[PDB]
Design a protein around this ligand. Structure first.
Ligand SMILES: Nc1ncnc2c1ncn2[C@@H]1O[C@H](COP(=O)(O)OP(=O)(O)OP(=O)(O)O)[C@@H](O)[C@H]1O
Ligand SMILES: Nc1ncnc2c1ncn2[C@@H]1O[C@H](COP(=O)(O)OP(=O)(O)OP(=O)(O)O)[C@@H](O)[C@H]1O
Ligand SMILES: [Mg+2]
Ligand SMILES: [Mg+2]
Lengths: 343, 343
């Protein structure tokens, strides 16, 4: 049996979603192959080891569900090769980590880097793919370069936002404008700017969340989401359409679904993603495909889109979780050897 | 006084260079402002706390210089806000980390992510800038997109290298071809392919070091290096020319030096670098400028190019180290507040 270190929670608006994801994953984990070890991260950034039967407060109340802050702290020994995760006051050897920490550090490559420094195999994108997908500015430029269509846009920081010319922006990108912080860690900060006079306040709110803010042209078209799974040979799920409230499978052509599937895969490859991502695209009347977002940490509750998309493609939740673990171990094994060359 | 956690060594061919860098930094650290704390990483990946007077074996012998493996281990408490770095068997509170770990994990964003997860301010690029610069494939695509010239090239993985057509490559990119692994962690793996028949062996050696291998067209022109310093408002040093053996200042025009300085800065900005980088460009007869590399972990010995370039620009070694620390704290303070918004 292999021990699966489920790390979840985080300083995030999505904190409760991560709680639910953890409970869902825990209940689907195949007991023939896996034993869980639970590490919860509270809303202050603090790590707590918990027992599976007692890691949640008010588990069955979605308005009150909270992390049991057991105060059982965690230590990581960088460069350790065994018992890398240690109790501050013993803990099962973890063999693979399934990180579902929502929030900037859980998503942006930082947590991934810590897991790398501890030599722990782990589920999902590695440092680069996470950092790159998470920064919507760098992601659009990378996508753009791989000749995938993304919304046209301009990016400002604090040092240049003070200089923004709304008329030139409206002349270039039109109206409405979508203003957003570059780090996709939160959905906070996103304003639809309908008139010229609303622009400055959008720009200033977004800059309280990140150092970079994208201002994008509106993309007119339907919203489609597509789940991707895999390392070197990624696979795409059937499509889900979001309505102006997700519909699975989306009401579109086999051939349209196929174009979107192919673009989701190329988008995934271009950013260097691994394990899993959800790709959200706009489908134009006419039907060009424009990528909105590649998300490297989808939801994993039973009501979440990413696993629903897989369910609708013939892949059960249990089976999805298992395959995410196997992918994490295959990547880890491959990386070992490469790390291994040197000196 | 602020405590400077110097972390150095690493599983790297450059291991001894990091040793020397550490000793140089230690001797220039301004004693009015800074106390050092030493953490050495041996060639196995293992962390050792040392005293400044005793961290090296054979310090004055460049052929024998080695890390004193004091076996004084280190623990990191993720999400800790104080005493984040802890002895396994006490250690001064670290206030800023100056990481000089050569090798894949020290350079590619992983170490940076661990430092982020420990909430430690640290010198040099953050997760994204390090990951992106380190992967020469993603870096060239990002550079390319920012309309900076890079050597034309094709990138293969294991899954596509088996399919490589040398004739189409020679038809597209010419001869010689430069074959290299994408991760710039090592200088190992770089072959100059002079005839068609040498190509397959280059490709196969490079693939033992990374999962991705660039094959580039030769760029005919002189090799120039330029040091960059700063966060939001980067500054460029005078230029150094490498000869077919560095010359400082380079023998080129004020105006050529200025074009190279500007391109180094734009390259630095495009990849999202912070603190420091060395930018290595080719200067064509004719004189277009093509970027070869952006390096986010330059050498820091007294004989290294990056500090020599700064010395030649009026910035003393002591003064350079101090400014790298201040930049690390300014970034950390700014990020704090942003992290701070949320929920
Ligand atoms: N350029 C655009 N054109 C048209 N609609 C847009 C654009 N940008 C965003 N939107 C709309 O706003 C929604 C939210 O934007 P986006 O998805 O980038 O931010 P987010 O932080 O990821 O929010 P969410 O968590 O809902 O995805 C999109 O689903 C879409 O409905
Ligand atoms: N496309 C190219 N055209 C011409 N010369 C090249 C090219 N690529 C590499 N070289 C030569 O080979 C040297 C080493 O290549 P590169 O610098 O990319 O690898 P590295 O691993 O960073 O090596 P180093 O540590 O010496 O920089 C370059 O300084 C240059 O002399
Ligand atoms: Mg979206
Ligand atoms: Mg170079």
């Amino acid at each position: 049996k292999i021990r699966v270190g489920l790390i979840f929670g985080g300083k995030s608006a999505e904190h409760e979603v991560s709680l639910q994801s953890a409970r869902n994953i825990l209940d689907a984990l195949d007991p023939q192959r896996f034993e869980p070890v639970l590490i919860g991260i509270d809303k202050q950034g603090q790590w707590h080891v918990n027992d599976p039967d007692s890691f949640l407060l008010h588990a069955d109340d979605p308005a009150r569900i909270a992390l049991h802050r057991s105060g059982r702290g965690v230590a990581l020994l960088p460069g350790a090769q065994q018992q890398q995760l240690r109790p501050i006051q013993a803990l099962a050897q973890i063999d693979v980590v399934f990180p579902i920490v929502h929030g900037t550090l859980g998503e942006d490559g930082s947590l991934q880097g810590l897991l790398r420094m501890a030599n722990l195999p782990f589920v999902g994108s590695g440092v680069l793919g996470s950092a790159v997908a998470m920064d919507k500015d760098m992601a659009k430029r990378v996508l753009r370069d791989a000749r995938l269509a993304v919304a046209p846009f301009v990016c400002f920081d604090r040092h240049t936002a003070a200089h923004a010319d709304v008329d030139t922006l409206i002349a270039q990108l039109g109206l409405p404008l979508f203003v957003k912080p570059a780090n996709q860690g939160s959905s906070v900060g996103v304003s639809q700017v309908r008139t010229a006079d609303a622009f400055a306040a959008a720009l200033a709110l977004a800059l309280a969340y990140d150092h970079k803010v994208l201002v994008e042209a509106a993309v007119a078209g339907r919203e489609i989401e597509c789940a991707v799974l895999g390392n070197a040979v990624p696979h795409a799920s059937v499509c889900g359409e979001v309505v102006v409230e997700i519909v699975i499978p989306a009401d579109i052509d086999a051939q349209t679904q196929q174009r979107i599937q192919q673009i989701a895969v190329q988008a995934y490859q271009a950013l260097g993603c691994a394990g899993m991502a959800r790709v959200d695209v706009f489908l134009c009347a006419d039907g060009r495909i424009v990528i909105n977002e590649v998300n490297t940490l989808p939801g994993f509750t039973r009501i979440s889109v990413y696993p629903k998309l897989w369910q609708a493609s013939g892949l059960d939740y249990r089976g999805l979780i298992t395959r995410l673990i196997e992918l994490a171990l295959e990547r880890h094994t491959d990386d070992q050897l490469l790390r291994s060359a040197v000196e």
